[PDB]
Design a protein around this ligand. Sequence first.
Ligand SMILES: Nc1ncnc2c1ncn2[C@@H]1O[C@H](CNCCNc2ncnc3c2ncn3[C@@H]2O[C@@H](CO)[C@@H](O)[C@H]2O)[C@@H](O)[C@H]1O
Ligand SMILES: [Mg+2]
Lengths: 202, 240
Amino acid sequence: LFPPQWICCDIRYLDVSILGKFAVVMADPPWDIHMELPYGTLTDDEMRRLNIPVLQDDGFLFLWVTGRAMELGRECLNLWGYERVDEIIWVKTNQLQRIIHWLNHGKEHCLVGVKGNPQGFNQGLDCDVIVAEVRSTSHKPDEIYGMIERLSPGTRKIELFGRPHNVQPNWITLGNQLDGIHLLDPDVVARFKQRYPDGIIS
Amino acid sequence: NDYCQHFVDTGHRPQNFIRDVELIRLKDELIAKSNTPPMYLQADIEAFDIRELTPKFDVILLEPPLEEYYRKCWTWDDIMKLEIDEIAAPRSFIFLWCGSGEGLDLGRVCLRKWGYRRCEDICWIKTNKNNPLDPKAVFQRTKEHCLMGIKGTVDIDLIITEEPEIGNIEKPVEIFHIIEHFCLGRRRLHLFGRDSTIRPGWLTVGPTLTNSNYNAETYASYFSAPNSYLTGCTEEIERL
Ligand SMILES: Nc1ncnc2c1ncn2[C@@H]1O[C@H](CNCCNc2ncnc3c2ncn3[C@@H]2O[C@@H](CO)[C@@H](O)[C@H]2O)[C@@H](O)[C@H]1O
Ligand SMILES: [Mg+2]
């Protein structure tokens, strides 16, 4: 069911097996980098224990990383059964196309992992650099969804740790700052009602 | 404006539309004064005992000829068997050119294998304003990564230049400016440099060098007291 769908939940406890299989997985996880943090974070073990492996048979993972999560993200990516085959760089500009410990950071990284053998994807249409303006804090650019749609048009996709602005057609967004549960795909709706007759994750 | 869409339409890479490419020039001048004379040595590094390279270095810049630069090549197998930890100073830094493929993973193993942790990921973004694939590639690769590692206790992490002509494997000389502006020490080693990369303040060692002038004793003499701990960014120490 093409229109946006989402599930407010704690992704640690949600039984993601009810959601089926996706051509693309994207995540912008709340990595525990050594800081106070304006939001809540996931420990390295919770990140490792996420049940990503059930979400795909053949397809691509997009995984935002920063700081020491450039290494931890690679660990998670490999533990979950993916091979890192590409790495997208978003160059952060202002409205005038100028770029915003040892060096100042003009960019954020997005690891691209493959699992299985995806077939019928349009590999090579886009290039691995995004130039796009910063929006709110920890707000990734919209251009990633068009890149992902040209790569795998019309397939089901799932985003983890998304926020309300992340909800898109063809995507199921999970996150704990979404508003409630909006589900339209009848297969998903059925399995959700079965797993959660009273509509609560614990 | 969606520059990803635009590249799909026109072939102009999104980085083609980045603009803007007191004074840090006194700093460049202090760097230039404290620079040791250029020293260089032809060495076939596979067959070489790098322990002969002394003293131990404050900075190592490592630029192995990857097969992927050509479309003797060094595989990551060969690279991670280099005994870099035997010539690095207990507190020191490495800058490792990793390419854009498996090098982004195997280069991190190398850094860890030699005792470093990565503190920066410097990206060389290549524009194609003048001319608008690996089987596993999902996207067109338009950049290379130079990983920065540290061991022991003004600039941005992006270099933007036009894609060099096919067959040209040189890396942007801007990498030297970034390194030297960090003021990390004066023993600087460039492994797999060339005649065209030789540069004041650096020891260059590579197989294609046509001449050598390296002498370990002469080289160590540049850092004997009172100069042992200079950062490379300060005034020289006065003599007689
Ligand atoms: N067990 C879990 N299960 C499911 N989702 C989880 C989760 N544990 C964390 N999440 C959710 O994963 C998302 C992680 N996204 C990474 C991007 N980073 C930011 N995310 C959100 N707000 C931010 C961010 N950076 C600055 N802010 C500012 O602070 C806020 C409050 O002050 C707000 O006002 C912003 O403006 C996030 O939604 C988490 O809640
Ligand atoms: Mg050894």
